[PDB]
Each structure stands twice: as structure tokens, then as C-alpha cells.
Amino acid sequence: PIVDTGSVAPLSAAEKTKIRSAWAPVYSTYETSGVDILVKFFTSTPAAQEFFPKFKGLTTADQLKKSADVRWHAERIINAVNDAVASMDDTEKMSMKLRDLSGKHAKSFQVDPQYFKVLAAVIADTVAAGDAGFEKLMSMICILLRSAY
Amino acid sequence: PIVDTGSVAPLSAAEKTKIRSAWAPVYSTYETSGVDILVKFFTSTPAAQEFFPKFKGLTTADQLKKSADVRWHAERIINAVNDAVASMDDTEKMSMKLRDLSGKHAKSFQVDPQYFKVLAAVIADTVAAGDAGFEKLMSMICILLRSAY
Numbered sequence: 001p002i003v004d005t006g007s008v009a010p011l012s013a014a015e016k017t018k019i020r021s022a023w024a025p026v027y028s029t030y031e032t033s034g035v036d037i038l039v040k041f042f043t044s045t046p047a048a049q050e051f052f053p054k055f056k057g058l059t060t061a062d063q064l065k066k067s068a069d070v071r072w073h074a075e076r077i078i079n080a081v082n083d084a085v086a087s088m089d090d091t092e093k094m095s096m097k098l099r100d101l102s103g104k105h106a107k108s109f110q111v112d113p114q115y116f117k118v119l120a121a122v123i124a125d126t127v128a129a130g131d132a133g134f135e136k137l138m139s140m141i142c143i144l145l146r147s148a149y
Numbered sequence: 150p151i152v153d154t155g156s157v158a159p160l161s162a163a164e165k166t167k168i169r170s171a172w173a174p175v176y177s178t179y180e181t182s183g184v185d186i187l188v189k190f191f192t193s194t195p196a197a198q199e200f201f202p203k204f205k206g207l208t209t210a211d212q213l214k215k216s217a218d219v220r221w222h223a224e225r226i227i228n229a230v231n232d233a234v235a236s237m238d239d240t241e242k243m244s245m246k247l248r249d250l251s252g253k254h255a256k257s258f259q260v261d262p263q264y265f266k267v268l269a270a271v272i273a274d275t276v277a278a279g280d281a282g283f284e285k286l287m288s289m290i291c292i293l294l295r296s297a298y
């Protein structure tokens with residue numbers, strides 16, 4: 001499963017290749033992909049809904065998909081992941097980016113760090129439900145997004 | 150016209166209101182708006198094309214609108230402006246954001262500062278062709294994006 005603590009073994013050349021493949025199609029239409037994922041996560045995880053101030057008032061999955069605020073937010077998340085995917089070969093760069101992102105969440109957005117793996121789960125279940133290699137990537141991302149807390 | 154040097158008078162309550170109105174519709178579909186603007190700017194201003202490394206190979210306005218890299222890039226620009234519009238009342242905040250953005254362009258992206266006003270012109274011509282109040286906002290944005298150079 002997806003972890004957000006400790007450490008995970010390096011990604012193997014085989015795993016990286018599987019990821020790039022499973023990913024490519026999803027990013028080709030991140031506009032949509034992104035929105036669905038975020039809408040799915042949000043509608044099914046009420047406890048974290050209070051952390052998206054700009055979505056106050058939006059309850060149905062219908063309204064959300066029509067809000068430009070939901071789309072922007074969803075588009076940024078989906079690309080942060082895309083950035084990671086693109087840095088799988090430069091673990092150095094991937095860290096700097098996410099560690100910076102971790103800081104923003106902890107100091108400015110003040111979001112509960114427990115949902116990182118919950119949303120990561122939806123992204124994984126959507127992009128490549130079942131792949132363990134992709135679960136590693138999401139675990140690294142989660143572990144790093146919590147580094148600032 | 151749009152300036153990127155010196156200073157400009159403060160926005161009047163009247164101008165701000167005109168701006169918010171002319172903007173709202175555009176942002177409601179920034180996904181599209183953004184792409185068109187960026188595609189227009191890029192296709193008609195060759196001299197600045199070499200500054201978008203990720204667009205190498207893309208020449209027709211057809212290819213561009215299909216590239217996820219163009220879309221992401223266009224979506225970020227369009228929102229930076231949206232951020233400004235939202236800060237028209239807090240000139241303080243608007244500065245910090247843009248001054249930071251100025252730095253990234255000068256130190257990391259290494260873009261020629263002369264195109265800020267050229268692209269700003271297309272955004273203005275598209276969102277509210279003719280409005281002088283909107284030209285002020287774009288001027289403030291341009292003056293600030295050059296502060297780091």
C-alpha cells in the first residue's frame with residue numbers, strides 16, 4: 001500500500017517504465033483526469049473538506065466540476081505529480097520540489113498531513129490501480145510532502 | 150498604452166470594478182482563454198519563441214493547442230494575472246507575488262524582459278480591448294515583472 005513515513009526502496013528501471021506508460025495517457029488530458037480525481041477524493045472524504053476554503057458551499061460532485069477554483073486546484077495537483085514522474089531519474093530534483101511543496105502546505109495552507117496518502121491513493125487507483133511500482137512513487141511523494149511538518 | 154517602466158497612477162474604484170467585470174467571464178474559462186492568448190502571442194512573435202524550450206518543434210497554432218505543455222504554461226500565466234486582479238485592493242500583496250515571479254523569470258527562465266509588455270498587450274486586447282483601466286493593471290504587472298532584472 002501507500003506509506004507516508006520512513007523510507008522506500010529506489011524505483012527500478014522496470015518500474016519507472018511501467019509508470020511512464022500508465023501515466024502518459026492520464027496526463028494527455030490532465031484537465032479532466034485532475035478534476036475527476038480531486039472531485040472523487042473530496043466527495044468521499046468529508047473530514048478533509050474543511051481544508052479547501054475556496055470550495056465552501058460546493059457539496060454536489062456536479063457543482064465542483066463546474067467551479068473554476070476546483071479546476072485550477074486540481075490542475076496544479078495533477079502537474080506536481082507529473083513533475084515527479086518526470087524527475088524519477090533525478091531523485092535530487094524531485095526532493096527539492098516536493099520539500100518546498102511540503103513547506104507551503106504546512107505553513108501557509110495549514111492542511112492536516114494525514115490526507116496526503118488518502119488523495120495519493122485515489123491518484124494511484126485511477127492512474128494504475130494495482131501497480132505496486134506506482135505505489136512507491138506515491139509513497140515517496142507522500143513521505144516528502146510530510147517532511148516539513 | 151501598456152508601459153513596463155517608471156510608474157503609473159493608482160487604480161480608481163471605478164476602474165477596478167470595470168476590470169472585475171471584464172475579467173470574470175474570461176477566467177470562468179481560463180483553460181481556453183489562456184491557451185488562445187498564449188498561442189496568439191507565440192505564433193505572431195517569433196523573436197520570443199526561442200524562450201519556450203518545451204515548445205521546440207511546435208510551429209502550427211494547431212499543434213500548440215494540443216500540447217499539454219502549452220496548456221499548463223498558459224494556465225499558469227492566466228492565473229498569475231487572476232491573482233493580481235484579486236489583489237487590486239491589496240497593492241502590498243500584489244507586489245510580493247509579482248516581484249517573486251520577476252525573479253524566477255530573470256534568474257531561472259532567463260527570458261528577455263522586453264516581451265512582458267508584448268504578451269500583456271494580447272491579454273489586454275483579448276480581455277477588454279480598449280479599456281485604459283485594464284491597461285494600467287497590465288502596466289503595473291509589467292513594471293513589477295521587470296523589477297528583478
Ligand code: HEM
Pocket residue numbers: 048051052053073076077079080081101104105109111112115116119120123141145
Ligand atoms: C496528492 C498529494 C498532493 C500534492 C502533490 C499536492 C500538490 C499541490 C500543488 C501543486 C499545489 C499548488 C501549490 C501552490 O499554490 O503554490 C497545492 C496547493 C494546495 N494544496 Fe496540495 N497537494 C497534495 C495533497 C493535498 C491535500 C491532501 C490537501 C489537504 C486536504 C491539500 C491542500 C492544498 C491547499 C489548501 C492548497 C492551496 C489552495 C489554493 O490556494 O488554491 N493538498 N497542492
Ligand code: HEM
Pocket residue numbers: 197200201203222225226229230250253254258260261264265268269294
Ligand atoms: C504576461 C506576463 C507573464 C506572467 C504574469 C508570467 C507568469 C508565469 C508563471 C506563473 C510561470 C510559472 C512560475 C513557476 O511555476 O515557477 C511562468 C513561467 C515561465 N515563463 Fe512566464 N509569465 C509572463 C511572461 C513571460 C514571457 C513573455 C516569457 C518569455 C519570453 C516567459 C517565459 C516563461 C518561462 C521560460 C517559464 C517556464 C515555464 C515552463 O516552461 O515550465 N514568461 N511565467
